């Protein structure tokens, strides 16, 4: 619940800044906005690509840390770690 709330807020903010910066960079706009142009399942797939390296994921570090901490706790609960 909370993780997706934060992700949605961050994606809205990044879309707003891309819309602000398209006038400076119209050429960059296409593959900047491809993420918003992608279907929602593929959007969440791109946003969930920071498990190992893969910095192309637009997700910020302050949300990556939340997901990694919860994943560590889940692995500990499952006894895998």
């Amino acid at each position: 619940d909370d993780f997706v709330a934060k992700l949605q807020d961050n994606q809205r903010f990044r879309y707003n800044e891309v819309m602000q910066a398209l006038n400076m960079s119209a050429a960059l706009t296409a593959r900047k906005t491809k993420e918003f142009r992608s279907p929602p399942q593929e959007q969440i797939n791109m946003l969930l690509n920071f498990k190992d390296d893969k910095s192309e994921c637009p997700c910020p570090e302050e949300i990556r840390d939340q997901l990694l901490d919860f994943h560590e706790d889940l692995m500990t609960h499952c006894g895998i770690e």
Binding site: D1, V4, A5, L7, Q8, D9, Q11, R12, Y15, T33, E35, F36, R37, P39, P40, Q43, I44, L47
Partner: peptide, 19 residues
């Protein structure tokens, strides 16, 4: 490509669908 541009991003979906 106007429809492809305006197609709803993840932040427009209801919270439960995105969850």
């Amino acid at each position: 490509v106007v429809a492809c541009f305006r197609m709803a991003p993840l932040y427009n979906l209801p919270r439960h669908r995105a969850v």
